[PDB]
Each structure stands twice: as structure tokens, then as C-alpha cells.
């Protein structure tokens, strides 16, 4: 029952400890063609696919409130990167999937959220990190979180070298507890894929 | 078409042994018959021993029947003439040959196609 | 795989590249396969090639894997999943269902490909297949068994007889 | 009918060209056609 | 796709699982009746030869594809190159029957002789392996297609007609020693 | 009557000395989706647009048979370039436009052709360069040639770092003759735009 | 007729422009499928030969008319005069496959051997020129029709069946040195 | 034409004969043509042969040309347009349209003609084609490009293989 | 159908005499038939 397969482009990703998909703030994008781009925007389907990223090592000496962030878009080395440095205005949403593989004989809880317009949180504000689209990773139940978010911002198209609307956040809620038969450490990775990639304003070359 | 590479000649004295080898240049799927002709000094060429490629059917001369032995290597596509207990009369120029056209036993020593340059075997006493 | 085992073992290291092999029926990893034993008797092929990944670790041991198809055009394959995330790939973790099938696409210029690599010329005409270990928890000596079968549109074309006899 | 490419009928009767089978089922064809495909669990395309 | 592995059910994923498209295939060349229907050599001939298909080379096309099945049925065609006449006796015949012309005897024409033989074994199918014996590494002596005889036979070719194979077995390829793949020379024009 | 405007993407190009458009070997592309790419090809519309290139200076001391070539695809510094170094297999046609601006008081003839599978021509073979899709530039009449060609080759998709199917060729047919009131020299430029750009086989990044 | 020359449109004036009359024509002999269907020689044969059509003489009928096209497709017929057997392996085969009789092998009859071969290249069309390479003046090594092998081959003839030519290229004639035209001897009866 | 140029240049002289060549696919002027390269592989021909004349002078340069077909029966061709005006001809000046096509008729005794001139025997079996310069104004170095293609009823008949190999 | 002059059908099937084309246009015929003829401007015969 808890078997999920996501296919983004020519890339797939299967998980047998699925707990569902979390949609944040919307179940689909709003109008991609607006009056600010004057009819000259195009969609790129070759850029919508998965790419890996390493977040942090979940050790037992990290207490509650340990925050790790990753601003999106990141340093991309593929088609998405040449899109970012080749066009002036871009917009796209995200389809994120975080995995923390230990074994079922561990304990602890992680909070995986997608925060819009990141700003550093005070120690008392971390108690309310569940106001954003989120899921939990508990070795007791699952090894994989999955959130899907639209594009939002004050502008309909963005210059990603100047602004980053979304940020992926992983917070230690309950410290990792291990035993003699449990995994002594857990490594956390992200598998992110842009969604509905539209571009506008082609730039001159550098060569 | 086909060229033959001979090896193993040299000089020995009476009572020893020699081993001659011959490998053809191409490995076509034919039933060729590798044979050995020898030409004594001041005499004409003559047949010594032949062998078929498919089976190990061996012909021999009345001169060298119990002494000499011929074999073939299916893997390396070679043929070897193991000369044993040489006599001082065994001094000659030894030639190999191919005989691709027909492979019947009755004619196994009469008409060969490709010769390949001969080796020199000079046994002393 | 190395040491002649049908499986790759998780590594207690910084390296996340389990195994890597050319997309070729004449590869060193496929030398003992039935698909390869058949394909040796044909000149050309085309179509899909399926890989199966069976996890044989205990219940208290989790892991997350990744496989990517790296088509030709680079000189050396990537050795980081972060860098191989830009190819065609798939990810999967361990759970109740212990098998996973990934289907290698037939992508090339010609409509058919040779089932034999010509000469010591390098950089296999088709791509590579790279298996990665995204993460694992308490999986120190657990293995992952790999096997291969033909796809839905696989095909061998011209019968030959190439072995030394 | 494998590796025979003449359109004209045979000159000899079927009783003489080859033997005759008597009576009194492709397993692997059915075993491959009955293979599983698709997915397992839910899908979020 | 994810499935239960230990159940051993066949699973065929497609390229449609990530947007691709399964193409149309033609498998005329890997047909069992098609691929086994070619003349292949028998490199151990005698004045008297018993036609046993397990005497084909184990690494040839037909030889290896025949070792990759437990049971089989087939008619036969042979191409013999002989001196004198060629006598054929069916499966079960005395060895002394091969010296008489009441049996199928072919008076030799110029190049060679090409015949068609039926299946005469007393069993419903023949086998390439046998676990045990048949008297009171070695197959039963009734696993043959007859015997031929001439004064000397130069070459023998055989061809399987109406071939049927059952219960497949392992079929191996040449092993790769240390390379990344088995590299060999492939035909290419001169210059 | 001889006014033509070509729009390729968000780029236009107008000419008032138009002589027509020459289609070579085809008026439209053949099947872009074949069995060799297995359903995994995509079209990029952001790469189909014009880019400039300088061919040669047409001086008066160049005799008949002076050949200048330009193999396509060239060194592209924009979206087309990242396409070429980002995917393994590409295919596209061309829409070329050459201009040699002098004045109407000059004389001479140029031959602009698109040769498939270029190979160097012998001096006697240049008399038959009009077997390929071509047009002439005569200062007497026009300043602009325009040819449009499909994609062709032994393979349905190409690896452009290994093979270049098309080549643009400009040959001096009649030497440039100038007078006291004519332009003493002519500079030749090309304005090329790919057509029906399809890609397959995304490659890993280098970063 | 007068027209715009630089536009490069085809123009066909007639003799009707000054009172004449265009006559009926029959062009059966300049048909592409007709003219390429004749046996032409290959004058560099080896014990092992890879059938490449770009080895026909560049000034023969078929040789030159084939150099006058960029791409082509064709089946083939060959006439080989050999000693021993003649093995043929298709496009892509190892060079070691040419020593086995599982492949098409022809046991030599008296005058010569005449076979018909299909098109086995992995590409949709073959080419006479290639702008670039195919590895990681010379065409790709996959531009062939297979290979043959015998103990020695004396002559090889080839014939293009169902020929199709694309994208024409220059085709030259012998050059005239100083004359008003190229004069040569033409057949005429004796006396 | 002379010096191996695809064009004839107007002459500041009393001579009004630009170029002259035999009606023969083996002529010196047609040696580099595709029509001739094809016709070398056939025994006989019949039908029309079209000539194209493209003027590549400036706008401020005018001219008037003439081409005549001179069938066989005279020993030497005419060198004056006044004398070649009695053959089949056509005249044309320069203007907006810079091309002109003239169609050489197939006029002879036999229904077919050889595509190869036999021996050093003179006086080509078919006629000549003579291009004239009627007049020109301020056209000192301007050229006229000539090319040839097959007509509507052109035909080649018997395939041969005549080149030394 | 070029350079074959026998009226009787072939003895071998089409599957064996030559290869078989699969699917998924004469340019120069149409390029010559679409050629311009006639005249340009007016005529005074």
C-alpha cells in the first residue's frame, strides 16, 4: 500500500516507505503567461528532472532545533544551469523528496519543510516550523518525505541570480537514538526536480 | 591466397629428436591436408607424412613409419611432425604443403597446392 | 561484479559508486549472462534491456539506491550521484518489496547497434550504467543482487558463428 | 516453416520428405506474455 | 516498478515508466525453427560414423544452441563427401547391416551427396543430458539418427529440420579476463 | 514586391532586395520521432533563432572559383551551444540568409550553396557547384540570398561533435568590378537559424 | 525567354519559342534503377575482402554514377571466383567469424559462384562522403555490405539491386587539352 | 571559355564574336558540365539543349547580345552578326531580368547523333553555336555567364563504359 | 523494376530474395516538372 513511484522526465524514483505526497499552498500552478512577459515566454521540458544533493549527517549529538537549509535553485551543472545563465527571467516550482535511511531499530524525528522567502529563525520560532508545507521522517515508520510546491513571489517571473523564493529546511525534532542493533549514523540526501519550467528574455553569449 | 609458416628446423646428431611445425596464414573453413615433403641433397622431392584436418587420418612413407609421428592442433590451427631416432640419411630439406582441393585418403600424397619455403635439417653422426 | 559475485555490497566509505559497467552485451559484468550468451551469436541488436535489483539485507537495515544511464559524449563517467542526477535515473529505498526493475533505453544514432565492441578503442559506443548508494542506515555488509533480462522490444538481427572452433 | 523460401509446392509427398507426427503448448511464450508491468502502489506523475 | 523478488515472477518494465515509448520488434531471426536450420560441421568422421548430434562443436551456433536445451526433436539432412557408395542404416540396426545394399545406399556422384533422413529413435524426444544409465558423461546408445559407412568419409554436414527444443539450460559466452569489455577485431574496409 | 520578412523565434530580418526563398531537397522535415531514440526525444523552441557570422571580404582581386566555407553547426555561444554540449544526440535543419552589401553600381556574381557532407572540390568540380541548393548574389539585382534546408544524414540523430552534415559555401563566380562611384570592397555576413531542434540523451554535468 | 537569374529557379525553354515542336522522348536508359543494375568489377581482392562499394573504379559506369550521389541504398549480388569454400559474414561481424561454416558458406562449383546478399548496414542509408569521424578521405567502418573469405579470390563482381540514389554531386568527363572537342576512335567496319 | 572562365567579357575592339563552340557533348567548352559528364556514358542522343545567359554587369552598363545556331554545311562559321543573321538566332538586351535562355534545336539527318566525335576529322557533324555582341554602352569589363542544361525532349540512348580503367 | 526481363514469377519468396523495407517522394522529378516555360512580358508574333 505504501509503494510510490514518481516519474519526472526520463527519471524515476521508487520508495516502499511512502507516507504520501504533501502539496503546499496549491495543487497546481497559476497563470504562467502574464502581461509582464508580453507573449515571449517558452517552456523547457528537458530541464524538469531529478538531481541529487547531500544535506547533512544525522548524528546522535544533535539536539532539538538543529536546522539545515538549502536554498533553491542550487548550483546546477546540467540543463537547468544553462537555462539559469542563458535566459534573464525564469519561473518554476519544485518537487522535493528527502530520504534518511537507517533501520527500523532507530528512534527520532526529523522535520522537512519548504519555507518561502527564507529568513533565519530564532530559537523560539522553531517551535512553529510546522506552519509551512512539511512532513516528518521517523525511522520508526518511513525513510522518505515528499513535498510538492508551486511558484510564488512578488513578481510573476524571477531573476534567480538575485532572488531565491524557496528554501528546503530539515530540523532535528527528536534526537537520533540508536542501540547495538541500530544504525549508528544517518546520512540525509535530497532529490529535487523543477516543475513547469518557463523562461523569458534570452541573453547574449559570452564566447 | 595461403602462405605457410614453418618452424623448428636445425641441426642434431644421430639418435636425437626434432619437432617441425607449420601454421597457415588464413584460418578458412576447409578440410586441408597438411603434409611434409623432404628433398635429400642431390635428389628429388619426396613425400614423408601427411595428416587430415577433420580427423587425425595420417599417411606415412615406407621409410619413416614407426619413427615419425604427425599431429594437429585444432585450437591453434597447427601441425607438428615429431621426428624420432634420426638416421644420418634423414639429412634433407623439409617442406610443408597444403592440398586444399580434395581430401581423400587414397590421394593424400600426390598433389598439393601451397608449399611454403623449406626448412633445413642436417643430422650428423 | 568484482571478485565474481552477483551482488554489490554497501561500503563504509566516502565513495557512493557501487558499480559501473558499459552498455554492451560484451561487457565484463555481463560475461556470465544468458542474454549475452545468446547475443554472442548475432551481429546487431536493438531495444530495451532490463536490470533487476534485489535487496538481501536484514529487516533492521535500510538503504536508498540510485541507477543512472549515462549516454556517450563524456570521456569518463560521473562518480557522484549529485553529478549523475542530470542523466536519466531512478531512486528507490528498501522495504516490503525487495525487488526493483529499471529499464535501460535504446538511445543512439543508428537504428541498430553492434553486439560486439570492435577493438581496444575506448569510450564504449553506448553509454554506461552507474549504480549509486544514496544513503544507508546500519547496513554494513548487506548486499544488493543484480540481474538482467531482455526488454519488451529487444531484438537480435543477423545470425553469425563467431567462436573459434 | 523455418528457413524455407520457395513458393512452389514440394515435388515429393509429405509422407516421404519427413516423418509424420501422431497425437494422443508453448510454455515460455505464455510465461513471458504473463509478465508484470506497470507500477506498484500509487503514482504522482 | 517494485515487486516481491523472492516470488520469482517475471517482471517487464517499459521505457513508458518515464515517458518513453516501446517500439515495434521483429524476432524472426531468434526463431527456434529458423536458427537451427543451417548446415553445421561434424569434425570427427570415420569409415563408419554414427550420427549423434552431440558431436557438433559445443561452441558453434547450432552446437551451442543445442546444448542449451534439455530435450529436442528433429528430422535431419546430411551432406557427405565420400569415396565409393554410402550406406545408411536406421536407429537400432546391427552394425553388420551396413555392408549390404538393401539399405539406403547412395552411389557417389561427383561433388558430394545430400540426403534427407527421418527421425527413427524409439523415444518421443532425444536428450542432451541423462541422469543415469540404460544398461544392466555418456548418453544412452539409442540417442542417434542412424549410421553411415563408406570406404572413407572426408566431411559430414548436418541440418535440423522441423526442430523443437524443450527445457532451456545455461548458454555461456567467452569470458572477459581483465578488460572493461571483450574487444575484438570487426570487419572494416581496407585503406 | 521584393520585400521579405523572416521571423525565427523572437528575431526578425527584413530585406527589400529579396529574390525569393530556395528550398533544398525538401519543403519540410521528415519524421523526427523514430525507433532509434525510443520515445525520449524533446523539442527546444528557445534555440531556434538567428545568429550572425562573418564569411569573407569580397575584394576585386579574387578570381573565379574562390571558395569560402562554413561548416554548420558552428561555435555557438548561446542556447544552441549549451544544447550541443548538454545532450548526446541532436538534429535540426537550417534557414540561412547571406548578404553582400555594395551598391547598384558594382558588378560581379557570387554563388551561395548548401553542400551536404562537405569534401574539398577540385578546380574542375567547381563548375558544377549548382547541383546543390543555391542562389546568386549580383550587386546588379539583389544583396541577399536565402536558402532553407532540412536535416539529412545516414543516422536520424547526430552527434555534432563528431559529424557535420551541412556546409555553407560562397564561391566567386564573376570577379567584383568597381568604378569611381561604386563600392571598392564588399563584406559578406551570414544570418543562420536552426529549424526544428530536437534533442535526446541528456548528459551529466561537469560542475 | 527572359527571367530573374539570381533567383535560381529552373527554366526550360522549348523550340516552340520560334515555331518548332517538342518531340516525344523515352528515358528508359537513364533510369536510376536500370543503369545501376549491371555487374562491375572490383580490382582489389584479397584472401579476405570487405565488400565496400567505394572500391569500384571511380571512372567506370557504376563507379562514377555512384560517386555522383551523396547517399544511396541497395541490395547486392556478387560473382566470386575462388578456390575452396567462400564464407560470407554480415555487417558488424567479428573477423574471426569468417573461419566457421555456420555462416553462409559456398562450396565451390566449377566456373564461379553467384549469390544475392541483402542490405545489413545499421543505417537507413549509406554515404559516399562523410564530414567527420565515428570513433572516440575515410568513411565509417560500418559502410559496407559484409565480408567474404577464401584461400584466394581471383575476381569479384558486384551488382546493385533496387538501387536508390539521393542528393546528386558533380560528375565529370575527360578534359579537352587544346582541341576544339575531344576526338577519339569510334568503331567502324574494316576495309 | 578561354582561360577557364564560366563567362565571356565584352571587348573594346572591332570584333563582335564573343565565343563559338561545336554542338557536341564532347566539345572543349562543355568538358566541365554535368550534361557532358552524363553523356560520356552513352552512345547516342537526341533532343533539345538549353543555354542560359546571365548578365553580371552593373546597373549603369547596358549591352545587346545575339546567339545563332549554325547548322553544318559551311566550312568555317561566320564571324559577323550581319552574316550570321541568316541562321536561327535570337537577340536580347540587358535590363531588370538578367537571365536569358536559348534552346538549341536538334536538326539532323539521322534520328540520333553520336555523343562522341570520331577522329581528327574536322567540321563537327552538328553545327556550331556563335555568341555575338551586337552593341554595348559603357560595358568595358562586364561579363556574361553561360551555362547549359537538358531540354524538354532530350534523351540518351545506349549505355556504355568507355573510360580507361 | 529495373533491368529484369523474365515474365515468370520468381521461384523464391520475396522474404528471401531481398530485404524488406519498413515505414514510419521524388524531389528532382517535381523540381523539373515545375520549371518555367513560355515567355515573359508581351509577345508580338
What's the topology here?
This is part of a larger assembly, with two copies of chain A (207 residues), one copy of chain B (125 residues), two copies of chain C (165 residues), two copies of chain D (45 residues) and two copies of chain E (191 residues).
Chain A: E1 4-8, E2 11-15, E3 22-23, E4 42-43, E5 51-58, E6 67-72, H1 79-86, E7 87-100, E8 107-116, E9 134-137, E10 144-149, E11 166-177, E12 186-202
Parallel strand pairs in A: 3-10
Antiparallel strand pairs in A: 1-2, 4-12, 5-12, 6-11, 7-10, 7-12, 8-9, 8-11
Chain C: E1 7-9, E2 17-22, H1 34-39, E3 44-46, E4 49-55, E5 62-70, H2 81-84, E6 88-93, E7 99-104, E8 113-114, E9 128-137, E10 143-150, E11 155-156
Antiparallel strand pairs in C: 1-10, 2-9, 3-8, 3-11, 4-7, 4-10, 5-6, 5-9
Chain D: H1 14-17, H2 27-33, E1 42-43
Order of helices and strands of chain A: EEEEEEHEEEEEE
Count every helix of chain A, treating DSSP H or I runs of 4 or more residues as helices.
1
Main structural class of chain B: mainly beta
Task: Note the total helix count of chain B.
Answer: 0
Described by the principal axes of the CA atoms, the overall outline of chain B is globular
- Shape, principal axes of CA atoms of chain A: elongated
CA distance, first residue to last residue of chain B: 40 Å
PDB class: virus
Keywords: fmdv, antibody, virus
Entry title: FMDV (A/TUR/14/98) in complex with M688F
Chains A, F: VP2 of capsid protein
Features:
part of a larger assembly; 9 chains; B: 125 residues; six-stranded mixed β-sheet; four-stranded antiparallel β-sheet; C: four-stranded antiparallel β-sheet; 6% helix
Q: Quick recap of the structure?
A:
Chains A, F: It comes from Foot-and-mouth disease virus A. Chain C is mainly β and 165 residues long.
Amino acid at each position: 500500500d505504501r509503494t510510490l513511484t514518481t516519474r519526472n522526465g526520463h527519471t524515476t524514483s521508487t520508495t516502499q516507505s511512502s507516507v504520501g505526497v504533501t502539496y503546499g499552498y496549491s495543487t497546481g500552478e497559476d497563470h504562467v503567461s502574464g502581461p509582464n512577459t508580453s507573449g515571449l515566454e517558452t517552456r523547457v521540458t528537458q530541464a524538469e528532472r531529478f538531481f541529487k544533493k547531500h544535506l547533512f549527517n544525522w548524528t546522535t549529538d544533535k539536539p532539538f532545533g538543529h536546522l539545515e537549509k538549502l536554498k533553491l535553485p542550487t548550483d546546477h551543472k546540467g540543463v537547468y544551469g544553462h537555462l539559469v545563465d542563458s535566459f534573464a527571467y525564469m519561473r518554476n516550482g519544485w518537487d522535493v523528496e528527502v530520504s534518511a535511511v537507517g533501520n527500523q531499530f532507530n528512534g527520532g524525528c526529523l522535520l522537512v519543510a519548504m519555507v518561502p522567502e527564507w529568513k533565519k529563525f530564532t530559537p523560539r520560532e522553531k517551535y512553529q516550523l510546522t506552519l509551512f508545507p512539511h512532513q516528518f521522517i521517523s525511522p520508526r515508520t518511513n525513510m522518505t518525505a515528499h513535498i510538492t510546491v508551486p511558484y510564488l513571489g512578488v513578481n510573476r517571473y524571477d531573476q534567480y541570480k538575485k532572488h531565491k523564493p524557496w528554501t528546503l529546511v530539515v530540523m532535528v525534532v527528536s534526537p537520533l537514538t540508536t542501540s547495538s542493533i541500530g544504525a549508528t549514523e544517518i546520512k540525509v540526501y535530497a532529490n529535487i526536480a523543477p516543475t513547469h519550467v518557463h523562461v523569458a528574455g534570452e541573453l547574449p553569449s559570452k564566447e | 591466397q595461403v602462405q605457410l609458416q614453418e618452424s623448428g628446423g636445425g641441426l642434431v646428431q644421430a639418435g636425437d629428436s626434432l619437432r617441425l611445425s607449420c601454421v597457415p596464414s588464413v584460418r578458412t573453413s576447409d578440410n586441408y591436408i597438411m603434409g611434409w615433403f623432404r628433398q635429400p641433397p642431390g635428389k628429388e622431392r619426396e613425400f614423408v607424412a601427411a595428416i587430415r584436418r577433420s580427423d587425425g587420418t595420417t599417411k606415412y612413407a615406407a621409410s619413416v613409419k614407426g619413427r615419425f609421428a604427425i599431429s594437429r592442433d585444432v585450437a591453434k590451427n597447427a601441425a607438428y611432425l615429431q621426428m624420432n631416432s634420426l638416421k644420418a640419411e634423414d639429412t634433407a630439406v623439409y617442406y610443408c604443403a597444403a592440398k586444399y582441393q580434395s581430401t581423400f585418403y587414397s590421394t593424400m600424397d600426390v598433389q598439393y597446392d601451397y608449399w611454403g619455403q623449406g626448412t633445413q635439417v642436417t643430422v650428423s653422426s | 561484479f568484482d571478485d565474481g559475485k552477483p551482488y554489490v555490497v554497501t561500503r563504509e566509505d566516502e565513495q557512493r559508486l557501487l558499480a559501473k559497467f558499459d552498455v554492451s552485451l560484451a561487457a565484463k559484468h555481463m560475461s556470465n549472462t544468458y542474454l549475452s550468451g545468446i547475443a554472442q551469436y548475432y551481429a546487431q541488436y536493438s531495444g530495451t534491456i532490463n536490470l533487476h535489483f534485489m535487496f538481501t539485507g536484514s529487516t533492521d537495515s535500510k538503504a536508498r539506491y540510485m541507477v543512472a544511464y549515462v549516454p556517450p559524449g563524456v570521456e569518463t563517467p560521473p562518480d557522484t550521484p549529485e553529478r549523475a542526477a542530470h542523466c536519466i535515473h531512478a531512486e528507490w529505498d528498501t522495504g516490503l518489496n525487495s525487488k526493483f526493475t529499471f529499464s535501460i533505453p535504446y538511445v543512439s544514432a543508428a537504428d541498430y547497434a553492434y553486439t560486439a565492441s570492435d577493438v581496444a578503442e575506448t569510450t564504449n559506443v553506448q553509454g554506461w550504467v552507474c549504480i549509486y548508494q544514496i544513503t544507508h542506515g546500519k547496513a554494513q555488509n548487506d548486499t544488493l543482487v543484480v540481474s538482467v533480462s531482455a526488454g519488451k522490444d529487444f531484438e537480435l538481427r543477423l545470425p553469425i558463428d563467431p567462436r573459434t572452433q | 516453416s523455418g528457413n524455407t523460401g520457395s513458393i512452389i509446392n514440394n515435388y515429393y509427398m509429405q509422407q516421404y520428405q519427413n516423418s509424420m507426427d501422431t497425437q494422443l503448448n508453448d510454455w515460455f511464450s505464455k510465461l513471458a506474455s504473463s509478465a508484470f508491468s506497470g507500477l506498484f502502489g500509487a503514482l504522482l506523475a | 516498478t517494485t515487486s516481491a523478488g523472492e516470488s520469482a515472477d517475471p517482471v517487464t518494465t517499459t521505457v513508458e515508466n518515464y515517458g518513453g515509448e516501446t517500439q515495434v520488434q521483429r524476432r524472426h531471426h531468434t526463431d527456434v525453427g529458423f536458427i537451427m536450420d543451417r548446415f553445421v560441421k561434424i569434425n570427427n568422421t570415420n569409415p563408419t560414423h554414427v550420427i549423434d548430434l552431440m558431436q557438433t562443436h559445443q561452441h558453434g551456433l547450432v552446437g551451442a544452441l543445442l546444448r542449451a536445451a534439455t530435450y529436442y526433436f528433429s528430422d535431419l539432412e546430411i551432406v557427405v563427401r565420400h569415396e565409393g557408395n554410402l550406406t545408411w542404416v536406421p536407429n537400432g540396426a546391427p552394425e553388420a547391416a551396413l555392408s549390404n545394399a538393401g539399405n539406403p545406399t547412395a552411389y557417389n556422384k561427383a561433388p558430394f551427396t545430400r540426403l534427407a533422413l527421418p527421425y527413427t529413435a524409439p523415444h518421443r524426444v532425444l536428450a542432451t543430458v541423462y541422469n543415469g544409465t540404460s544398461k544392466y558423461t555418456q548418453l544412452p546408445a539409442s540417442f542417434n539418427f542412424g549410421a553411415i559407412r563408406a570406404t572413407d568419409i572426408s566431411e559430414l554436414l548436418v541440418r535440423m529440420k522441423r526442430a523443437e527444443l524443450y527445457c532451456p539450460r545455461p548458454l555461456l559466452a567467452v569470458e572477459v579476463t581483465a578488460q572493461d569489455r571483450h574487444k575484438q577485431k570487426i570487419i572494416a574496409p581496407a585503406k
